C-alpha cells in the first residue's frame, strides 16, 4: 500500500507492504539505474544497520512531498 512513492519502477504500490521501510540498502553494488534511496514496503524492523540504512517507519504518510528526480 503506497508506502512512499514507489518501489522498483514508477507505476504502482509496493505489492508487499506494512511499514514505510525506508531501505537505503546497496547489498554490495546497487545495480538499479540509481535508486533514490529508501522507500520501503516490507515487514518489521529486524536489523536497520550494517551497509543498510533503513528508516523503517509505521506512519500514515511516510513520503514527504511528491518529489522524485527534481530539476
Amino acid at each position: 500500500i503506497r508506502c512512499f512513492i514507489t518501489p522498483d519502477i514508477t507505476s504502482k504500490d509496493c505489492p508487499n507492504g506494512h511499514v514505510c521501510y525506508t531501505k537505503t540498502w546497496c547489498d554490495a553494488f546497487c545495480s538499479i539505474r540509481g535508486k533514490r534511496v529508501d522507500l520501503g514496503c516490507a515487514a518489521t524492523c529486524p536489523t536497520v544497520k550494517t551497509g543498510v540504512d533503513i528508516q523503517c517507519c509505521s506512519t500514515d504518510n511516510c513520503n514527504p512531498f511528491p518529489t522524485r528526480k527534481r530539476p
Partner: peptide
C-alpha cells in the same frame, strides 16, 4: 531511432518492468 527506453524508475512516465 525507435528504441526509446524501458528506463524511468523513480517516476516520470510509465514503467521499468519490461
Amino acid at each position: 531511432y525507435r528504441g526509446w527506453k524501458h528506463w524511468v524508475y523513480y517516476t516520470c512516465c510509465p514503467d521499468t518492468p519490461y
